[PDB]
């Protein structure tokens, strides 16, 4: 079967495009086939619903590693982001949403999602995440009141 | 076009050579077998999991320790009374009836009281007719005392915790009967021939007594038990603690004399005959008349009459070498290094010598 | 689903046959019923670092196949079926439970789970939650205008190519 | 899979993923020269 | 949750885990799929007998 | 500064206290009454909350033996449900907007006012150099007959 | 107030609060009511036919619109990957 069953370090993304993928994309875009298709202008414009929602309601999962900044004055805190982001994306994110403007450099490094087996032995892999190591001018730390 | 399977379970079932992999590597060394541990997961995690509120409210509905002690003592007395008496034949020793129904009530009594009682000791005191009578009388006295005046050890622990959050009177009748029955069980265990167990029982039996005479008697008994168990250090310790309690003991008690005897015998077993003679001399100057001291002094003098004829004294580097009593032989039979099996040359001990711990 | 907590149910088969009890819990996704003082066994709790091993009696879930309700008036076994009935004070129609023999409707008791309590630090007041600040005429103006501008620009580009 | 066998977490031992006493042996004995940096070479040459 | 309900007694109505009975197969069928109408099925369930 | 990281991390776990489960999530009935700017504000609020929750969940996964399961895990599900309801409301509003827009645009296209060379198109009366005649007949007549007549 | 029902054998101490026992609600006959119908009364109808097979998991909103069916599918897939209620695993192949 064309289903890739390997969940290791060398998992490959299949470049072949299937008909079901296009069908699902179109259906989530404009409710195919019940609703009439929007014109090409609105489809290719910045007002098309997916791009409009991604621009007015951005969805980016930024997770801070507790060990990197917990009870230690660190100058290089690390974060986990989606793979579709970049250094400029992350620095703009931290500057506009959380207000962290003093960002010296972001060290990018991809990482395969965490894999594990449950009690019955099924191989379930967590979603992929990109590791970023942001550098600040001043060392930061969040103390843990013991 | 062939596949390689290093070590796979056979047709009948997985053996130890594969369970070792299952426990260390995490799965079988072939990889074709999927790790499936649902059964042990259910046996361990699903069982030990308890919600926080129920865990916190559990401590509110624990059973009453006084009622538990009363019921356990009642049931144990009923069981030891129902236990039959051994019929003595003539020509062959009759096998004593095994204590099958006695382990559960005795175990409940032990876990309620905080002390351990030997099954061998219980069997021996039940076989012995007079010891059985002493044990039954002491157990009935303890039952009556814990039913009428509560539990003196529990009240003492409660007062101790109270004074810790915010003296010690003499021993009560319940604790007296308890240490009496424990000494009876220890005597039966010594008659059966388990000296280490007898010493371990008396070590906790001493905790219930607080009067100096009872403490001196328990110290003398522990000294004798450790002497028979070949733990000369503890034997000497208890033997001299007896003489330390001597100034506060009644004049009619000879527990301090027995402690002197045990200390002198421990010194003699340690091969310090001069120290043993000095100890027995002090004991005689204290109690001019005592058979336990006089017999030991005569034995030590009979040995010292021949001591200077062989080496003029006992050596210094050869002390505590000759194994005299068979208890240490019986213990070394189990705790000894085997020939090629378990020794300094076997790797399971060589690595323990190499690594720190 | 007919078995709800509060009914008197008699065990018809298996262990405890012929005993009546009150439904204490309903495990719907497993089709099981925890009945009062019926099929009680000793559940154990392992010793923790501070507590010893603790064994206590607790009822266990009973399958639904071997239990049957008891009529409130007749006090006998009766077949019960779902019945849609409108309320007198509420025009909506709710589902009650009716017996074939006596014809008695049984209401469904609500859940009423008060155990879950929110924290006032991350909870918005219901007044601010219910106040409305949306205007359909004004907000749809900008959107429709942007859509029109985009579509007209693309149409002008297509006309340019043509 | 030695890392997942020993350094990883198990129902018997805590996670050693971030533990210096367990990770320090991973570093090489003989030091090695640093690898060439193409970004640094570009920012240094600054082609014209 | 089985252990928790056994220890507490709270009544659970919905399953605590979402069960995908297709094992990832329902995502393979197109979204607008629907079973067609089959007239005159060769079955007896439509009669709705209760005595046999 | 440091407050950004303090809000990235949790507060009850920081003070070693049991975090409580909140009351409920945003419902579609409420999000319909809420306005667009208000919707995106509460969306960013839920996004920050989800970031903090995911950081705590990842910390507990990193320390699952030192620390047990994450306390109050339904908060992530509530946040995801609120975000999905926000997306639903925004999608409904966008659907209404695009329906109105395509109606207006098709009306404009039917009018025929667009022209790549910028300028008003020529008038229809100056172009329609033809006429139509409607004749009422009492019975059907062949088209070729009408043509030849 | 104890937040759980006591076990079999426990005695509620003085001054404690316990969630009330499940009691049967009101009782009313059917003869007094005028509008009474059965659940699923039509057995020979043709509208109760399934549009999707019984093994298909329902992924839809409560109203019936499939606007965010892929969003709900992605949420369920993320839940299957890493469930938020996942307790302490027992496997030797732990994620961390």
Residues contacting residue C115 through CB under 8 Å, at least 6 positions apart: E10, G3
Q: Is C95 close to G39, i.e. CB distance below 8 A?
A: yes
* Contact assessment for residue C159 and residue F116, using Cβ atoms and an 8 Å cutoff: yes
B232: its two tokens: 């000369």
Q: Distance between CA B88 and CA B86 in Å, rounded?
A: 6
**What backbone phi and psi angles, to 5 degrees, belong to E46?**
-70, -20
Cα–Cα distance measured from residue A100 to residue A91, given in angstroms and rounded to the nearest whole number: 8
Q: Which residues contact G68 (CB under 8 A, 6 or more apart)?
A: F84, F87, F88, F91, G61
Q: Name the neighbours of B, counting chains with at least 3 Cβ pairs within 8 A.
A: A, C, D, E, G
Yes or no, beta carbons of C84 and G7 under 8 Å apart: no
Please name the residue that has the structure tokens 């923790």: C48
Instruction: Return the structure tokens found at D37.
Output: 């940096």
- Which one of G22, G26, G38 has the shortest CB-CB distance to C107? G26
The neighbour count for residue A126, using CB atoms within 10 Å, is 16
Q: Could you tell me if B133 and B85 are in contact, meaning their C-beta atoms sit under 8 angstroms apart?
A: no
Measure the N-to-C terminal CA separation of chain A; round to a whole number of Å: 54
Token duo for residue B281 = 């001399």
Residues A31/A49, Cβ–Cβ less than 8 Å: no
Q: Residue holding tokens 């060394």? A: B29
Instruction: Let me know: does C39 contact C16? Beta carbons within 8 Å.
Output: yes
Which of F97, F107, F114 would best serve as a mutation to test chain C binding (most C beta carbons within 10 A)?
Answer: F97
- The distance of Cα G23 from the centroid of its chain, to the nearest Å, equals 21
Residue G12's contacts (CB-CB under 8 Å, 6 or more residues apart) are G6, G18
Q: Which of C106, C108, C116 to mutate to test the interface with G (most CBs of G within 10 A)?
A: C106
Task: Match 């895990």 to its residue by tokens.
Answer: F73
Q: Enter the tokens of residue C99.
A: 């017996």
Q: Does residue F64 belong to the interface with chain A, where contact is any CB pair within 8 Å?
A: no
DSSP bridge partners of C23? C35
Contact C44 B47 (CB under 8 A): yes
Chain G residues in contact with D8 (beta carbon < 8 A): 93-94, 96
With an 8 Å CB cutoff and a minimum of 3 pairs, decide whether chains F and D touch.
yes
CA distance E49 to B252: 100
Closest residue, chain A, to G92 (C-alpha): A117
Q: Which of A60, A61, A140 sits opposite F5 (nearest CB)?
A: A140
**From the CB coordinates, do chains F and E have 3 or more pairs under 8 Å?**
no
Nearest to F55 by CA among A133, A81, A124: A81
Q: Which chains touch D (3 or more CB pairs under 8 A)?
A: B, F, G
| Number of helices and strands in chain D (H, E) | 3, 0
Give the span between the Cα atoms of G20 and C22, in whole angstroms: 13
CA dihedral B139, B141, B144, B150 (to 10 degrees): -90
Q: How far is C109 from chain E (nearest CA, A)?
A: 12
Q: Please report, to the nearest 10 degrees, the dihedral formed by the alpha carbons of residues G7, G12, G13, G19 taken in order.
A: 110
DSSP classification of residue B248: G
Q: How far is CA B71 from CA B77, B82, B113, B205, in A?
A: 10, 16, 12, 21
Q: What is the C-alpha separation between F64 and F57, in angstroms, rounded?
A: 10
Preceding amide of A33 cis, omega within 30: yes
Q: How far is B41 from chain A (nearest CA, A)?
A: 7
Q: Chain F: residue nearest A137 by CA?
A: F1
State the residue for tokens 């996704």.
C29
G38-49 core/surface letters (b: 16 or more CB in 10 A; e: else): eeeeeeeeeeee
Q: What is the 3-state secondary structure (H, E, C) of chain C?
A: CCCCCCCEEEECCCCCCCCEEEEEEEECCCCEEEECCCCEEEEEECCCCCCCCEEEEEECCEECCCEEEECCCCCCECCEEEEEEECCCCCCEEEEEEECCCCEEECCCCCCCCCCCCCCCCCCCHHHHHCCCCCHHHHHHHHHHHHHHHHHHHHHHHHHHC
Q: Classify residue B214 by its DSSP letter.
A: H
What distance in Å separates residue A93's CA from the closest CA in chain F? 11
For the CA atoms of B68, B73, B79, B85, what is the dihedral angle to 10 degrees?
A: 170
Tell me if G4 and E9 make a contact (CB, 8 A cut-off).
yes
Decide: G and C in contact? Rule: 3+ Cβ pairs under 8 Å.
yes
Is C43 in CB contact (< 8 Å) with chain B? no
Helix (H, G, I), strand (E, B) or coil at A133: strand
Distance CA G90, CA G88 (A): 7
Please check whether residue F99 touches G, CB under 8 A.
Answer: no
Compare all CA atoms of chain B with the CA of C115 and give the residue at the minimum distance: B53
CA distances from D47 to D38, D41, F110 (A): 13, 10, 57
As given in the structure block, the two tokens for residue F129 are 């150099």
Which residue in D8, D12, D17 has the most chain G C-beta atoms within 10 A of its own C-beta, making it the best mutation to test that interface?
Answer: D8
Tell me if B91 sits within 8 A of B69, measured CB to CB: no
Put simply, whether A117 touches B (Cβ < 8 Å) is yes
Q: Which token pair is B186?
A: 């220890």
- Tell me which long-range contacts B290-293 makes (C-beta under 8 A, separation of at least 24): B290/B254, B290/B257, B292/B254, B292/B257, B292/B258, B292/B261, B293/B257, B293/B260, B293/B261, B293/B264
Is the CB of residue B68 less than 8 Å from the CB of residue B151? Answer: no
User: How is residue B25 annotated by DSSP?
Assistant: T
**Dihedral pair phi/psi, residue A46, rounded to 5°:** -75, -5
Pick the residue from chain D with its C-alpha nearest to B31.
D1
Pull the structure tokens for residue A104. 């010296």
E13 to C58: CB separation less than 8 angstroms, yes or no: no
Around G68, how many Cα atoms within 13 Å sit in the side-chain half-sphere? Answer: 21
Instruction: Residue A120: list chain B partners with CB under 8 A.
Output: 36, 38
C touches A, CB cut-off 8 Å, minimum 3 pairs: yes
Nearest neighbour of B59 by CB, restricted to C44, C51, C56: C51
- Phi, psi angle pair for C161, to nearest 5°: -65, -40
Which of F61, F63, F67, F68 is the best mutation test for D, with the most CBs of D within 10 A? F63
The set of residues, in sequence order, having a beta carbon less than 8 Å from that of E6 and lying 6+ positions away, is C43, C58, C60, C61
Q: Which residues of chain E does C24 touch, with a Cβ-Cβ cutoff of 8 Å?
A: 9
Site from B42, B45, B55 to mutate, C interface, most C CB atoms within 10 angstroms? B55
- Residue showing tokens 């810790």: B164
CB pair distance less than 8 Å for A145 and F40? no
Q: Which of A50, E15, D11, B3 is nearest to G91 (CA)?
A: D11
C-alpha atoms less than 13 angstroms from C-alpha of B320 in its C-beta half-sphere = 7
For residues B267 and B275, is the Cβ–Cβ distance under 8 A? yes
**Helix boundaries (H) for chain F:** 2-8, 28-33, 36-62, 74-111, 143-148
> Residue A89 forms beta bridges with which residues?
none
Do E8 and G4 meet the contact criterion of CB atoms below 8 Å apart?
yes
Q: What is the largest CA-CA distance in chain G?
A: 65
Max CA-CA distance within chain B?
98
Resolution limit in angstroms? 3.9
Q: Do the Cβ atoms of B280 and B302 come closer than 8 Å?
A: no
Please report, for residues A5, B305, C98, E30, E31, the alpha-carbon distance to residue A19 in angstroms, rounded to integers and kept in the order given: 21, 111, 52, 10, 13
- Name the nearest CA neighbour of B146 among B64, B73, B209, B206: B73
Contacts of B41 in chain A (CB under 8 A): 119
> CB distance A57–F40 less than 8 Å?
yes
Assess contact for F91 and G67: CB atoms under 8 A.
yes
Cα separation, B77 vs B108, in Å, equals: 12
């Amino acid at each position: 079967p064309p289903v890739n069953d390997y969940f290791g370090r060398s998992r490959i993304w299949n470049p072949i495009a299937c008909k079901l993928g296009y069908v699902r994309k179109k259906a989530d875009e404009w409710g195919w086939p019940n609703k009439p298709p929007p014109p090409t202008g609105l489809r290719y414009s910045q007002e098309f619903f997916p791009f409009f929602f991604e621009r007015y309601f951005p969805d980016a999962e930024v997770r801070l590693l507790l060990d990197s900044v917990l009870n230690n004055e660190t100058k290089r805190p690390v974060f986990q982001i989606p793979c579709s982001m970049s250094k400029v994306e992350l620095v703009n994110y931290l500057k506009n949403i959380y207000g962290i403007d003093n960002v010296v450099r972001v060290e990018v490094r991809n990482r395969r999602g965490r894999r594990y087996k449950n009690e019955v032995g099924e191989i379930k892999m967590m979603d992929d995440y990109k590791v970023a190591v942001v550098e600040l001018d001043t060392p930061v730390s969040v103390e843990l009141k013991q | 076009p062939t596949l390689y399977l290093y070590r796979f379970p056979g047709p009948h079932g997985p053996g130890p050579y594969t369970m070792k992999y299952w426990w260390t590597l995490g799965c079988f060394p072939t990889g074709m077998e999927v790790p499936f541990r649902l059964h042990e997961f259910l046996s361990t995690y699903q069982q030990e999991h308890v919600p926080v509120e129920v865990e916190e409210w559990l401590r509110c509905y624990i059973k009453d320790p006084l009622s538990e002690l009363v019921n356990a003592s009642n049931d144990f007395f009923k069981a030891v009374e129902v236990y039959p008496e051994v019929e003595s034949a003539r020509g062959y020793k009759t096998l004593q009836p095994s204590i099958a129904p006695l382990l559960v009530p005795m175990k409940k009594f032990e876990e309620q009281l905080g002390v351990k009682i030997s099954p061998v000791g219980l069997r021996s005191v039940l076989s012995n007719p007079v010891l059985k009578d002493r044990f039954l009388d002491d157990l009935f006295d303890y039952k009556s005392y814990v039913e009428k005046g509560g539990s003196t050890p529990h009240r003492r622990l409660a007062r101790s915790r109270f004074e810790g959050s915010l003296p010690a009177e003499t021993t009560a009748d319940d604790e007296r009967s308890l240490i009496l029955l424990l000494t009876t069980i220890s005597e039966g265990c010594i008659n059966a021939g388990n000296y280490s167990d007898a010493a371990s029982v008396l070590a906790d039996a001493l905790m219930f007594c607080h009067d100096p005479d009872s403490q001196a008697t328990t110290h003398a008994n522990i000294s004798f038990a450790s002497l028979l168990n070949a733990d000369f250090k503890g034997a000497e310790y208890n033997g001299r603690e007896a003489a330390l309690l001597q100034p506060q003991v009644k004049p009619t008690s000879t527990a301090c004399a027995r402690g002197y005897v045990g200390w002198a015998a421990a010194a003699a077993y340690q091969d310090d005959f001069e120290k043993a003679e000095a100890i027995v001399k002090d004991g005689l100057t204290l109690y001019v008349g005592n058979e336990h001291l006089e017999k030991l002094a005569n034995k030590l003098q009979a040995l010292r009459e021949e001591q200077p004829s062989v080496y003029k004294q006992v050596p210094r580097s050869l002390r505590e070498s000759r194994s005299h009593l068979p208890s240490q032989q019986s213990r070394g039979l189990l705790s000894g290094s085997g020939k090629g099996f378990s020794n300094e040359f076997d790797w399971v001990e060589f690595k323990n010598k190499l690594y720190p711990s | 689903w007919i078995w709800y907590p509060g009914d008197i149910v008699e065990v018809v088969s298996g262990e405890g046959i012929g005993q009546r009890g009150t439904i204490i819990a309903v495990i719907k996704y497993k089709n099981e019923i925890v009945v009062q003082n019926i099929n009680v066994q000793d559940v154990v709790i392992p010793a923790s670092e501070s507590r010893p091993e603790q064994i206590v009696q607790r009822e266990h879930p009973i399958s639904v196949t071997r239990v049957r309700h008891v009529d409130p008036s007749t006090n006998e076994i009766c077949n019960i079926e779902m019945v849609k009935v409108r309320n007198k004070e509420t025009g909506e129609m709710e589902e009650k439970r009716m017996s074939l023999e006596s014809g008695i409707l049984m209401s469904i008791p609500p859940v009423n789970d008060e155990l879950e309590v929110g924290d006032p630090l991350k909870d918005t007041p219901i007044q601010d939650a219910d106040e409305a600040t949306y205007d359909r005429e004004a907000e749809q103006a900008v959107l429709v205008d942007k859509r029109l501008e985009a579509m007209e620009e693309h149409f002008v580009q297509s006309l340019k190519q043509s | 899979c030695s890392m997942r066998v020993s350094i990883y977490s198990r129902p018997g031992k805590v996670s050693r993923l971030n533990n210096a006493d367990a990770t320090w042996h991973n570093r090489s004995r003989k030091e090695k020269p640093p690898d060439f940096d193409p970004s640094a070479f570009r920012r240094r040459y600054r082609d014209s | 949750v089985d252990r928790e309900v056994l220890l507490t007694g709270k009544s659970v109505w919905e399953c605590p885990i979402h069960i995908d009975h297709t094992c990832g197969g329902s995502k393979t069928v197109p979204p607008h799929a629907k079973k067609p109408v089959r007239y005159m099925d060769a079955g007896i369930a439509n009669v709705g007998v209760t005595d046999i | 500064s440091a407050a950004a990281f303090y809000e990235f991390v949790d507060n009850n776990f920081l003070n070693n206290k049991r975090p409580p489960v909140p009351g409920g999530s945003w419902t579609v009935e409420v999000l319909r009454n809420k306005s667009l700017a208000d919707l995106q504000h509460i969306w960013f609020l839920l996004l920050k909350e989800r970031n903090m929750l995911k950081s705590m969940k990842e910390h507990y996964l990193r320390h699952q033996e030192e620390l047990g399961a994450m306390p109050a895990p339904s908060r992530l599900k509530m946040i995801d449900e609120s975000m999905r309801n926000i997306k639903r409301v925004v999608k409904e509003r966008d659907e209404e907007a695009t329906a109105r827009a395509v109606e207006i645009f098709k009306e404009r296209l039917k009018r025929g006012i667009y022209r790549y060379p910028p300028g008003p198109p020529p008038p229809p009366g100056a172009h329609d150099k033809t006429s139509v005649v409607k004749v009422e007949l009492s019975c059907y007549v062949e088209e070729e007959r009408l043509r030849e007549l | 107030y104890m937040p759980f029902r006591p076990f079999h054998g426990w005695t509620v101490p003085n001054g404690v609060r316990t969630p009330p026992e499940p009691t049967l609600g009101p009782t009313a006959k059917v003869e007094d009511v005028k509008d009474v119908q059965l659940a699923e009364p039509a057995v020979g109808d043709a509208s109760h036919q399934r549009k999707l097979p019984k093994h298909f998991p329902v992924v839809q909103a409560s109203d019936g619109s499939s606007l965010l069916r892929e969003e709900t599918i992605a949420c369920m897939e993320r839940e299957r990957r890493l469930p938020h209620n996942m307790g302490k695993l027992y496997s030797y192949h732990r994620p961390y």
